[PDB]
Each structure stands twice: as C-alpha cells, then as structure tokens.
C-alpha cells in the first residue's frame, strides 16, 4: 500500500486511488502510510484495522443513495490528485447556499447480499462555530446511526486545534457491520461525511507492517517489520510481533543440538571407560 494507509482503502484518500478495490493474500502498509488526507483519525480503529488485514480485499458495491436540495461537491486543498479533490468513497455534504440552513434528511440502505458489509461514515469536527454555520448552518448537529444491533447518536465537537498540514479541523470516521437483510438508517442535519460505496469482504488474507522492499523471487511465510523470516526453526530472536505462520519469540540468542558423541582427545560410563580412549584408526563409523 506504500503511501496509502490501510484504513484509507474504504475512504480513498488521494494516494489510495490505485487501491480502492484491491484483492490480496498479503496486504503491506508502510510507516509513511497516512490513512487520511484531511487530518483526523478513525474511532475504534484498531478493531477496524484487524478486520481488514485478514479480509482478502474489499469488493465495494454501491449504496444507491441520492441526495436532494443539497450540494455534494465538497473538496479541500489538502486532498490533491490534479485539483482540489476529496475522498473517492465519501461525500462531503454541505448546504445549498452558505448561510440559510441544511435541510433535514434521512436515508437507509438494505443489505441484500449473503456477506456482512462494512459501513463507514464520518462526522466532521470543524474549527469553530463560525465554520459549521457556513458549511452546514445554524442550530445543533446530530447524526443518528442505527441498525438492529446498534444505535449511537453521534455529535460533533468544534473548537480550536493545532494545525496538521495547514488545517485545524478534523474528521472522525466510525464504522459498524451490517448482517444479511439488515438496514442502517442515517438521519443527519449536517456535519456528516456520507458513504457512497459500502464494502464487502472478498476472502482471506494476512497483514504485515514493514519498511522493506517487495521481492517476488523469494518464497516466504513469516513476515516482520525488517523483512521476512524463513527457516524451519521453531524459535526466533528477531522480532516479537512477528505475524503469519511465524516461529515463537524467545529471549535468548542461541540454543543447540548434536549428532553424537561427547569427544575425547587422545550413564554407564562407556565414552572413555575401561575402553578409556579413542581413534582415528577406523574412519567410517564410530
């Protein structure tokens, strides 16, 4: 994934664009992988990063949402492909005109496949009460997200923040899982980063964190941050957080074996016993 961050493959920030619908038996993510473009984070994101590494890719399907009396062309300068762009899977909704309002809306998506989906939506934490009155509008803001096993009723939290890459706002991306023939109804009066294409898991994979280069001539199975472990040895001193079909981490740095005899230079006492000595006379056996 290189400069893509593995949670961006369901959002599509401008470096994950070659990656939106991948399919892999080995996902690789890098230290420079920034999951976002607009600065922010995913809430409960280590549960989400542990779904995706063993998922075998993601097979996006449309959610069929249409939107009315509303603009959906929201972009920002921090997300660049050739111009001011946005995410590939999400929709920065806004107002129609800048200071009238945001009309109240409600949508719903019924899972109709066999597999469980992964929804991911977003709440936008603006910098002030002067920008949510110009992005979305006056009044309070509310984003209820409900299914058969779930409701949370999120809300933004504006305020002044430290800049990371020029902007002082955030976006938190939350996520649930729908089961077959369920629904999620989203009602929201603003401050919402709607999805446009939900995701369905394809198969199986593993996931590794690393910082070295890809080598398709080598054939290996146990992968850590500085590379790949390959032997039949049960114990490894190399890295404790080695994932895959990895050997077991240990503290000490050498453990041994033999083939045969304790050595004599020239539990019954046979090696140097009453036959007290050795040879170099015969040279095939012992």
């Amino acid at each position, epitope marked *: 994934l290189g400069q893509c961050g593995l949670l961006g493959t369901i959002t599509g920030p401008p470096q994950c664009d070659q990656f*939106l619908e991948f399919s892999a038996d080995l996902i690789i993510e890098r230290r420079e992988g920034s999951d976002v473009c607009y600065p922010g984070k995913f809430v409960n994101e280590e549960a989400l990063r542990q779904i995706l590494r063993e998922s075998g890719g993601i097979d996006k399907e449309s959610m069929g949402f249409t939107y009315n009396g509303i603009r959906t062309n929201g972009v920002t300068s921090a997300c660049r492909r*050739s*111009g001011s762009s946005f995410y590939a899977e999400m929709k920065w909704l806004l107002s129609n005109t800048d200071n009238a309002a945001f009309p109240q809306m409600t949508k719903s998506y019924k899972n109709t496949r066999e597999s469980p989906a992964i929804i991911v939506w977003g709440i936008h934490h603006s910098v002030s009460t002067a920008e949510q009155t110009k992005l979305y509008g006056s009044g309070n803001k509310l984003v209820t997200v409900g299914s058969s096993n779930y409701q949370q009723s999120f809300v933004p939290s504006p305020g002044a923040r430290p800049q990371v890459n020029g902007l002082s706002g955030r976006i938190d991306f939350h996520w649930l899982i729908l089961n077959p023939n369920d629904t999620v109804t989203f009602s929201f009066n603003g401050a919402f980063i709607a999805p446009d294409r939900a995701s369905f898991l394809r198969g199986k994979s593993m996931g590794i964190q690393s910082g070295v280069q890809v080598d398709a001539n080598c054939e290996g199975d146990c992968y850590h941050s500085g590379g790949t472990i390959i032997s039949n040895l049960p114990f490894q001193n190399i890295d404790s957080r080695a994932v895959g079909k990895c050997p077991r981490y240990v503290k000490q740095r050498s453990l041994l074996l033999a083939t045969g005899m304790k050595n004599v230079p020239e539990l019954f006492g046979a090696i140097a016993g009453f036959i007290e000595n050795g040879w170099e006379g015969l040279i095939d056996g012992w």
Partner: antibody
Framework: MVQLQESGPGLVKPSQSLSLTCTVT?????????WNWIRQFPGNKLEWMGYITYSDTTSYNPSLKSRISITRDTSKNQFFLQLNSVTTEDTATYYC???????????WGQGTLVTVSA | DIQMNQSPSSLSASLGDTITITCHAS??????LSWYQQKPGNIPKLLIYKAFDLHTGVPSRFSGSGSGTGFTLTISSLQPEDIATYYCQQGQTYPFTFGGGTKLEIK
C-alpha cells in the same frame, strides 16, 4: 460563467513554427487546477498532449516530449505552446481547456481548425 | 498506454428504447472514467465524472454505471438531440488516453 478563447493564424508549412495561444477572461491560472491542450483528428480521433499547472510544472505525451514546450503568462492571462518539427499529418483542431484532471476535463473551448499543408 | 476499446462503433435505435454500450479499458481504472458527449459539429461536453456523478446542469435521465474493467452507460427514453459520439476517458495513469467512439442514430 467561464469562457475561454483561442487565437492563432491558420497556415503552417512542414518543419515551421506555428504557435497556439489561449486567453481566459474572468478566472485566473494561479488557483490550483491544470491546463491541458487536446488534439482533434480528421475522423474525430482524439489525443491529449500536455499541460501546465498553477504551480509551473510540465508533463507531456511520451511520444511527443521532444517537440512540445508549454509556458504561461500572467498579464495576458495566457498559456503558450509552440510546436516545432511539424508534418502535414498534424492537421488538427487544438482545444485549450481548464482541465480538472482526475475530475475529468471540466471546461472546453470552441476550438480552432488550423491546416498544415505544402 | 492504456487502450480504450469502445464497442460497438455503430448502433441505431428508436425513440424511447434502452441502449447499453461498453467502454472496456485494458487495465484497472478503478473509478476514474469520465465520459463526453460529441455532437457532430459542436464541441464535446462533460456528462459523467468519477464514473458516477452528474455534472450539475445536465438533465437527470442520464445514468452511467459499471465499475472495474468493463463500464456501461444506459439511456432509457432516447430523445432526438441524443445523436452523438460518446467518448470515454481513462484517468488512472500517465499518459491519458481516449477511445475510438461510437455512432448513435435515429432509426
């Protein structure tokens, strides 16, 4: 409403220099989008050839990089291609555009049919 | 170079029919296709960007679809001004490519 206009004389002999010059009224080139030029064949086959950005960088078609120079000017609000080593095959219509790129090719122009002949 | 083989080159239909046509790109261009309406004698103009979104200004009965390798627009309720050559744009890599086009007539 954005509207952009080309200018240029309509004759060129092979291996000469004929320039293409696009002027944009009302909107600047420093705000961040790229500016492509697009080629139009007899038989309405099309190819792209290059662009200049808001940020002074160039990138061209990998069959044509030895032929193209794109530069741009601010007091005229203009972007500038001069195409050398021409051939009679290159009879085409050249569309200048505020090209959004990954959002497609947003604005277009009327386009000027220029002729290459002996 | 990523080739766009827009099939077929010619198709005619009646007013109110449904037509399904394929822009088939050679490699994976995940959501980056941008399709263009050429009137014969008038300039191309944008109708669909990012394979899904209507450029605001066009009437609503356009609906582009498909994803992946093969792509598809549909027109239900064909109208007499819909005589065009519908060009499609690859937008994953450099260089850009266009395609051969198609011809749509009133039968």
């Amino acid at each position: 409403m954005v509207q952009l206009q080309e200018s240029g004389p309509g004759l060129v002999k092979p291996s000469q220099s004929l320039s293409l010059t696009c002027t944009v009224t009302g909107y600047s080139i420093t705000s961040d989008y790229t500016w492509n030029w697009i080629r139009q064949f007899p038989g309405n086959k099309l190819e792209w050839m290059g662009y200049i950005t808001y940020s002074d960088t160039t990138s061209y078609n990998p069959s044509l990089k030895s032929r193209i120079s794109i530069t741009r000017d601010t007091s005229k609000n203009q972007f500038f291609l001069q195409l050398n080593s021409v051939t009679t095959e290159d009879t085409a219509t050249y569309y200048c555009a505020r090209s959004d790129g990954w959002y497609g090719f947003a604005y277009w122009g009327q386009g000027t049919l220029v002729t290459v002949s002996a | 170079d990523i080739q766009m083989n827009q099939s077929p080159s010619s198709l005619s239909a009646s007013l109110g029919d449904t037509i399904t046509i394929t822009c088939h790109a050679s490699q994976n261009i995940n959501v980056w296709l941008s399709w263009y309406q050429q009137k014969p004698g008038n300039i191309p103009k944008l109708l669909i960007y990012k394979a899904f979104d209507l450029h605001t200004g066009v009437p609503s009965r356009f609906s582009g679809s498909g994803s992946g390798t093969g792509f598809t627009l549909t027109i239900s309720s064909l109208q007499p001004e819909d005589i065009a050559t519908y060009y499609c744009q690859q937008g994953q890599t450099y260089p850009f490519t266009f395609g051969g086009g198609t011809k749509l007539e009133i039968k």
